[PDB]
Amino acid sequence: ERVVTIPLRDARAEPNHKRADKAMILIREHLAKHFSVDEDAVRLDPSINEAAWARGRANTPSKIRVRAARFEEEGEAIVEAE
Amino acid sequence: TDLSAQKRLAADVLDVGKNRVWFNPERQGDIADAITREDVRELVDEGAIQAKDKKGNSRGRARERQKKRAYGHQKGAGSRKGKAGARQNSKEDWESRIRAQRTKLRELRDEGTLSSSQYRDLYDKAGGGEFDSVADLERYIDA
Amino acid sequence: GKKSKATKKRLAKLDNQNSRVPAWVMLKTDRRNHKRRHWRRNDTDE
Amino acid sequence: TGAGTPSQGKKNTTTHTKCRRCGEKSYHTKKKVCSSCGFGKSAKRRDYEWQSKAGE
Amino acid sequence: SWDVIKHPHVTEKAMNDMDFQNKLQFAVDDRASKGEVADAVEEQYDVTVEQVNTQNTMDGEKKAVVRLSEDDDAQEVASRI
RNA sequence: UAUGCCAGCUGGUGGAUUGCUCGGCUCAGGCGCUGAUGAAGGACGUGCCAAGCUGCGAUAAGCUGUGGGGAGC
RNA sequence: CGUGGAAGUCUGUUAGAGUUGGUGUCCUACAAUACCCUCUCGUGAUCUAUGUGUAGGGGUGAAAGGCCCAUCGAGUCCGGCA
RNA sequence: GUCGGGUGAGAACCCCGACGGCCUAAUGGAUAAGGGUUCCUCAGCACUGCUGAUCAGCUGAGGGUUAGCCGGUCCUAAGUC
RNA sequence: UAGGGAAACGUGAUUCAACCUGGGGCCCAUGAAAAGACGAGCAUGAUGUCCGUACCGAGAACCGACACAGGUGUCCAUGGCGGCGAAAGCCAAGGCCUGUCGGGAGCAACCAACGUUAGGGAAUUCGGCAAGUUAGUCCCGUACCUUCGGAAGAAGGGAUGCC
RNA sequence: CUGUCCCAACGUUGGGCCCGGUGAACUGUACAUUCCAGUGCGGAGUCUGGAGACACCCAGGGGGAAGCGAAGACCCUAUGGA
Ligand SMILES: [Cl-]
Ligand SMILES: [Cl-]
Ligand SMILES: [Mg+2]
Ligand SMILES: [Mg+2]
Ligand SMILES: [Mg+2]
Ligand SMILES: [Mg+2]
Ligand SMILES: [Mg+2]
Ligand SMILES: [Mg+2]
Ligand SMILES: [Mg+2]
Ligand SMILES: [Mg+2]
Ligand SMILES: [Mg+2]
Ligand SMILES: [Mg+2]
Ligand SMILES: [Mg+2]
Ligand SMILES: [Mg+2]
Ligand code: NA
Ligand code: NA
Ligand code: NA
Ligand code: NA
Ligand code: NA
Ligand code: NA
Ligand code: NA
Ligand code: NA
Ligand code: NA
Ligand code: NA
Ligand code: NA
Ligand code: NA
Ligand code: NA
Ligand SMILES: [Sr+2]
Ligand SMILES: [Sr+2]
Ligand SMILES: [Sr+2]
Ligand SMILES: [Sr+2]
Ligand SMILES: [Sr+2]
Ligand SMILES: [Sr+2]
Ligand SMILES: [Sr+2]
Ligand SMILES: [Sr+2]
Ligand SMILES: [Sr+2]
Ligand SMILES: [Sr+2]
Ligand SMILES: [Sr+2]
Ligand SMILES: [Sr+2]
Ligand SMILES: [Sr+2]
Ligand SMILES: [Sr+2]
Ligand SMILES: [Sr+2]
Ligand SMILES: [Sr+2]
Ligand SMILES: [Sr+2]
Ligand SMILES: [Sr+2]
Ligand SMILES: [Sr+2]
Ligand SMILES: [Sr+2]
Ligand SMILES: [Sr+2]
Ligand SMILES: [Sr+2]
Ligand SMILES: [Sr+2]
Ligand SMILES: [Sr+2]
Ligand SMILES: [Sr+2]
Ligand SMILES: [Sr+2]
Ligand SMILES: [Sr+2]
Ligand SMILES: [Sr+2]
Ligand SMILES: [Sr+2]
């Protein structure tokens, strides 16, 4: 378990009106890479969802502090905001 | 589980719109077994099926604006959009003005201040548009 | 539209004709309803 | 307005209906005459020699 | 010659009218009136009819909702037949 | 030697072909009017379970009589 | 000066009606006449629903040979007819 | 639309919650015509659905429309027989 | 001491759709008919049959071969802010995520819709086609011509927020 | 007044491109890697002479196939029609 800062600047490559959707994909991709798990195994708690969608679908925050844990037999990650 | 049939029933039971009825995420299985309207009422009482509160637009910002405008502010040339006679109907203003002038003259006749001859002279002049307001009428009577 | 008593009987018959050929007829003849009418795709009388 | 597709939208009038006499959907409910059997026009059934080829 | 009562209409809604409202439901002949349905039920079951409500069903037949008096019990009349 | 060309083999696809005929086509002989005693035609019914066809008509794939027929239906 | 509130009157994407330009989009279409913006009329010779009438060398036509069920310098169907 | 979760052999699109949106003479409510069972329930996915489907206006089976006082019915209109 | 509401289970006011009732004006235009009702009381009792009644009413239940961006009548025209407004824009009630395929690449060329472009300013083109400019409201002010109505919002100039 | 132009640039959204799923049509005498000349019913990928040419695939804008679409509406002809 550790606290990570996820950069969400690559969501600018995706069209403006859909930024929140890509942000949520970037978060899952980052936690899968850094915690050495599969993207299917990363569980994002609704706190992260509400954080990225806070100012709508177009105005997403450039960064996001996230607390993630790593456990189990197959290997998975439960993640939340702070 | 498909709770859409119950959503329709809960909406009729609670007498609220479908989008405002809430179902407990932990009690989905119990709401799934809810076939009848009596089963729904039982679940309403258990607190499993609730109705959200309907929004009402806040009139606070409007009330503050209504106070400034009643005091004479926020009605300058840069705030007016309609034409002059649209903001105040000229026929309605004449109705307001002339009824007020005819009531003042009727009160002064019932008081004995003006005779039926003086009244007639002033009534006909008021009907001819000689007095702007009631104060302008009183200013003519007092010489 | 407002239907009469006779129009109602006719529409009723058309609905009854819309049923399948029973399971037992398939066994009796040793192996299809050609009058299969849909409310949208097909058209009735009147 | 086009005479094709946009003019087909106004078509919600009932004219031709099931006939009391012949059973065909040809009883014009406004004219009270059947276009198939002639019910409402004649006591005799509507039939014409041109409904078949001349030598048949 | 046609008979008035064809057969009893026994469905779940027909039972709710029998258990709670003392009403028996019948599938009758479509040429039969409310008064004719009333008489025929009294003459066949030895009951007293108060009100008859009819409907021309989408099955081509006529359904009649027949309410009996408080002296008669609808559940007891339906059990013997 | 990939992509691939020609012919064939095994298996498809397709339904020609050959064989078959409960349907047609044409010729011939016989016969030939029905209806207010409501025809012909149509509608809707009618079966244990019955959608189509056929039959039938609230006595509803049927009722009665006589003759034939026969151990099946 | 006021009152009055006339008008095939004006502005108006009110409803509603219409259809100038883009010769835009589409053009095996969403559509056998469509989409978007622009534009015109909008108390009157106004618009509109339903009912009703006029029928083919005949109707109907503020007239374009327009329209009479995607059909019109003579509708459609079948027959004449191979 | 997104994150969780539910059901399921199977879930991007079936259901629950949350978050985020869209519609305001309409994308809301009541109806005429016209449609004709398309309505509700259960069971289903061979068909139909611009992908998928456990969903459905689809498939199958059942069920459902109750009136002295709402319409028809009655009256007469242009007009028709 | 019906009903309904967890509860309270209000009182006054303004503007007032519906509905009621009057006054005026216009016509080379004159704005249905019939059944029925009233006129013509009260009690008690009986009777009141027959037909329709589901659902859709539309960017999927109608017409258009289609779950068609088309077409298709009525009533809700008084929900809040806004403003002249049944306008815009925003938001309730209510409805919806079915104008129903998705995933991925700072995502190239090219195309459709579109924003911004220095200096020049119609040189473009048959032609300012396309785009743009102007704009609401108040004050001042307003030419030729004219059928005296008009032209006319001519033009031109100034103002405009908040406290 | 201005991107109409000088003279074009950068950006925005949807496509376009790659992947899963769904899945048509137009068109097809045959052969077919062509180019330059020539010839031929005088407007040839196919004849003649040369030149060039290892095969397959992706994206592109459309030079050619006198490209595809429609038994030319112009013109003439018919002892044709209206
Ligand atoms: Cl009704
Ligand atoms: Cl008055
Ligand atoms: Mg005035
Ligand atoms: Mg059924
Ligand atoms: Mg009834
Ligand atoms: Mg008309
Ligand atoms: Mg189900
Ligand atoms: Mg659709
Ligand atoms: Mg410039
Ligand atoms: Mg030039
Ligand atoms: Mg222009
Ligand atoms: Mg030719
Ligand atoms: Mg010519
Ligand atoms: Mg001639
Ligand atoms: Na239909
Ligand atoms: Na029955
Ligand atoms: Na290849
Ligand atoms: Na004979
Ligand atoms: Na049968
Ligand atoms: Na005057
Ligand atoms: Na237009
Ligand atoms: Na004009
Ligand atoms: Na003719
Ligand atoms: Na979907
Ligand atoms: Na308002
Ligand atoms: Na530009
Ligand atoms: Na080319
Ligand atoms: Sr249809
Ligand atoms: Sr026109
Ligand atoms: Sr019509
Ligand atoms: Sr006649
Ligand atoms: Sr004849
Ligand atoms: Sr049924
Ligand atoms: Sr006008
Ligand atoms: Sr043009
Ligand atoms: Sr388009
Ligand atoms: Sr076109
Ligand atoms: Sr344009
Ligand atoms: Sr106007
Ligand atoms: Sr012929
Ligand atoms: Sr509705
Ligand atoms: Sr399957
Ligand atoms: Sr449904
Ligand atoms: Sr009548
Ligand atoms: Sr008043
Ligand atoms: Sr209803
Ligand atoms: Sr529509
Ligand atoms: Sr149109
Ligand atoms: Sr809402
Ligand atoms: Sr779909
Ligand atoms: Sr800038
Ligand atoms: Sr110029
Ligand atoms: Sr020039
Ligand atoms: Sr100015
Ligand atoms: Sr291309
Ligand atoms: Sr031609």
Q: Hey, where are the domains in chain E?
A: 1-81
**CA-based nearest residue in chain D for residue C10:** D18
State how many domains chain C has: 1
Q: Hey, where are the domains in chain B?
A: 1-55, 56-88, 89-143
* Fold of the CATH domain E1-81: Alpha-Beta Plaits (3.30.70)
> Which candidate, A76, A60, A77, places its Cα nearest to that of A11?
A60
User: Please, which experimental method was used?
Assistant: X-ray
Domain span including residue D40: 1-56
Q: How far apart (Å, rounded) are the C-alpha atoms in residues E58 and E60?
A: 6
Token pair for B135: 């104060």
Alpha-carbon Rg for chain D in angstroms: 16
* Fold of the CATH domain B1-55: 50s Ribosomal Protein L19e, Chain O, domain 1 (1.10.1650)
Query: Hey, is B60 helix, strand or coil?
Result: helix
Q: Which chain D residues in 1-40 sit with Cβ < 7 A of strand G? A: 1-8, 10-13, 15, 30
Helices (H), ranges, chain A = 19-34, 46-52
Which residue bears the tokens 């932990």?
Answer: B26
| E24, E8 Cβ separation under 8 angstroms | yes
| C9, D18 Cβ separation under 8 angstroms | no
DSSP D21: T
Beta strand extents in D1-56 (DSSP E only): 16-17, 27-28, 33-34
> Which candidate, E24, E31, E20, places its Cα nearest to that of E7?
E24
Token pair for D26: 């040809």
For residue D12, report the distance from its CA to the centre of ligand 37, in Å.
28
State how many domains chain D has: 1
Q: What CATH number has the domain bearing residue C34?
A: 1.10.1620.10
| B108, B137 Cβ separation under 8 angstroms | no
Domain span including residue C34: 1-46
Alpha-carbon Rg for chain E in angstroms: 12
Per-residue CA distances from D25 to A47, B55, D19 (Å): 66, 56, 6
Torsion angle defined by CA atoms of residues D2, D6, D8 and D11, in that order, rounded to the nearest 10 degrees: -120
* Resolution reading in Å: 2.7
Token pair for D24: 């065909």
The half-sphere exposure of A54 on its side-chain side, counting CA atoms within 13 A, is: 9
Per-residue CA distances from B29 to B3, B14, B52 (Å): 9, 20, 21
Indicate the CATH number of B89-143 among 1.10.1200.60, 1.10.1740.10, 3.40.50.300, 3.90.1150.10: 1.10.1200.60
Per-residue 3-state assignment (H helix, E strand, C coil) for E12-75:
HHHHHHHHCCCEEEEEECCCCCHHHHHHHHHHHHCCCEEEEEEEECCCCCEEEEEEECCCCCHH
Contacts of C14 (CB under 8 A, 6+ apart): C37, C44
Please count the other Cβ atoms lying within 10 Å of the Cβ belonging to residue B17: 11
> Which candidate, E79, E81, E74, places its Cα nearest to that of E16?
E74
For strand J, the positions having any atom within 7 A of a protein Cβ are 12-14
Per-residue CA distances from B120 to B2, B40, B108, B136 (Å): 84, 78, 12, 17
Q: How far apart (Å, rounded) are the C-alpha atoms in residues C33 and C25?
A: 12
Per-residue CA distances from B115 to A15, A44, B122, B131 (Å): 85, 92, 11, 19
Identify the structural domains of chain A with CATH numbers, from first to last: 1-82 (3.10.440.10)
DSSP D9: G
Beta bridge partners of A71: A76
- Breaks (C–N over 2.5 Å) after residues, chain A: none
Q: Inter-chain contact E59–C8, Cβ cutoff 8 Å?
A: no
Helices (H), ranges, B14-133 = 28-32, 37-45, 60-70, 84-87, 90-110, 116-126
